[PDB]
Amino acid sequence: AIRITLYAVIFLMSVGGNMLIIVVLGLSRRLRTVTNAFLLSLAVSDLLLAVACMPFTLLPNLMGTFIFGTVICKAVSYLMGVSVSVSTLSLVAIALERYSAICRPLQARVWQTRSHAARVIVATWLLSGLLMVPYPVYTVVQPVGPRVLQCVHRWPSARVRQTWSVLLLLLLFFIPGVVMAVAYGLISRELYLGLLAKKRVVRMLLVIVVLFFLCWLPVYSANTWRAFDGPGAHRALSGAPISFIHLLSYASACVNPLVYCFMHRRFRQACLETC
């Protein structure tokens, strides 16, 4: 259907556009900053997210079977978790760096630098690895039917299942959403209180927060939908709706280097000299 075509277009846009981010942010002609390093972390997270999730989720819905082995699916599951966690924590971290950059700017000029940026980036990488340790070890394969390789993620206790689901919904979606929203709201409040382009900045902030909420709502609500409703929920939500629900987060992954780097004027002009 339209899934293969739109996945092909978002494949070329996301992978190609993030590749320019990678090549221009890897080198530095005194251009690297706190936000440039954090966008490098966002770029490596989004590139890993694209190359790991987009085909290895579309093909199980279409083909019904992984061609590759089970250890490949274990590595893919670890890549799913670490890429999602680093992407959302990178969004929170860029929001917090901008929050301190405009609210109490003297304290941020005291306390933000390149070493702080790399320290916090390594902190999100290590904390995302450390908290989500049991994610790739509960993804053993159960074959169903004649030949279907599902590699479904299983948690034994229903209480453990719903606790991990609501903890993933809170700590990786809800607190990121509310921190992003209140931080960019304070950016707008001090932008109008301290002082045209301010309306453009406010529109940019509002569209970033509402785009993050709209794109990352269906996957987390679907995980809690499996967690609570259980039987019957999987029957209604199967095939193409799962693909589009993941595709909304996939569109978030592709637009994050677009809205954070490409749509801004200075980065586009700087990318003009690099090419």
Binding site: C53, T57, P60, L62, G64, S77, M80, G81, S83, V84, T139, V144, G145, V148, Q150, C151, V152, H153, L168, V219, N223, R226, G230, P231, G232, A233, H234, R235, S238, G239, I242, H246, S249
Partner: peptide, 17 residues
């Protein structure tokens, strides 16, 4: 195409991301 469920009320999920 082929549904994830091949039995009566099995509630087989999918990968979270």
């Amino acid at each position: 195409q082929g549904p994830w469920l091949e039995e009566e009320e099995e509630a087989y999920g999918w990968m979270d991301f």
